[PDB]
Ligand binder design. Sequence first.
Ligand SMILES: [Ca+2]
Ligand SMILES: [Ca+2]
Ligand SMILES: [Ca+2]
Ligand SMILES: [Ca+2]
Length: 341
Amino acid sequence: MIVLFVDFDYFYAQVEEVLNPSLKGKPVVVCVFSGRFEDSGAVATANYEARKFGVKAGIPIVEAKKILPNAVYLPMRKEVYQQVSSRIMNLLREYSEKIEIASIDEAYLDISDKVRDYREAYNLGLEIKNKILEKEKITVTVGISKNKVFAKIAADMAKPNGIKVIDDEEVKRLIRELDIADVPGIGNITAEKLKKLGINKLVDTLSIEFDKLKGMIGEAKAKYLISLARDEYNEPIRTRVRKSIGRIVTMKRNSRNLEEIKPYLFRAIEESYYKLDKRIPKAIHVVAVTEDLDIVSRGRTFPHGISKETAYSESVKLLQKILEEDERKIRRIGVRFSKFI
DNA sequence: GGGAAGGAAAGCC
DNA sequence: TCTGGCTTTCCTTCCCCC
Ligand SMILES: [Ca+2]
Ligand SMILES: [Ca+2]
Ligand SMILES: [Ca+2]
Ligand SMILES: [Ca+2]
C-alpha cells in the first residue's frame, strides 16, 4: 500500500493571508475570544512568523500579546476556513476514490492503484501540491509511505510546504530511532508512562512483556505500538462520517444557578441545530466545564429523533442532574448531539 | 466470559 | 491564562439482551 497524506500549512492563518495578501510576512495570530474579558480566550493557530517566537495553538491570547504585542490578531472565522477546506478536499478526490478526510485540514489517499512505486507517488504528490496552489493559493505538506501512520510522520518531518517519502528501509530505521513520543496517538500522558518503562523507541515495545505494556497504557494502544514496531500495521483508508456535533460556550461568570445558565445552554442548542443541518440526532448530551476545568456530562438517548423543542426541555433536566450530582460552579456549558438517523 | 452502553480519559485538530 | 471541537479507548455495570 502507498498512502499519500496531505496536511495544509498554518491553515487558519494561511487562509487569512490568502484573503488579505497584505498580511504575508507578518506574524498573524488567529484567536478564539471567549468574550469573558478583554482578550480572554486562546490562540487557534498562528503562522510560523509568529510561531517561531512561541506563539502557537492553545496558549492564552494574553500570553501571545506579551510575546508579540504588535502581531496581527484576528478572530477565528471557522466557517470561512471550512468552506475553503471543503473545496480543497474536492480537488483531492480527483486523485483517488479511496480518501479519508481526517480533519479540517488533513486527508489520506490510498494511491496504491494509481502509482506503481514511490517515484511515481512522489511525482503525484508534486502534482497535487501544484493543483492546490493553482486553484486555492494554499500550500500544503505531503507525506508518503506504506501506511497512514508513517505517511503522517513523513509530513511532520517535512512541513511546511514540503513533500517526503519514507520508504521501507527508512520505516525500519524509524522503528529503531524515532522518539516514540513522536508517534501519532502518543500524547504526554502516554509518553510519560512509556518513558517510565524504558520505552523510548517503537522497537523497545517488542522486548517488554506484553501484559506489562498493556497494564500501563491499555490493550489497544499496546497492540497498536507493537504492530507498528513489527512493521505489520495495516489500517485501510476509510470514508469518514461525522458522529457528533455540538457547541459549548463560555459564561460571563461562573455559576451553578439554573436560570443564569439557561440562556447559554439554549444559545448552544440553537447553534448546534444550525450545525446539524438536516441530520436528526437520537441522543443529546449536556456538557459542563467546571470552575476547576474538569469536564462533566449527562446524556439521554431517545428511540426517535430529537426535535429542537425536545432538545430544550431535555437539556434542562440533564443540566439539573449535573448540578444535583456535582457541587462545583460551572465555567462553560454546552450540548452535543449524536446517534444520527 | 464478554458485548453493550454511559461517562471519563486521552489524543489530535 | 486555560477556545472550541471531534474521535477512540478505558472503566464500570448490567445481564445473556442490548
Ligand atoms: Ca496534522
Ligand atoms: Ca496543518
Ligand atoms: Ca507526542
Ligand atoms: Ca445492557
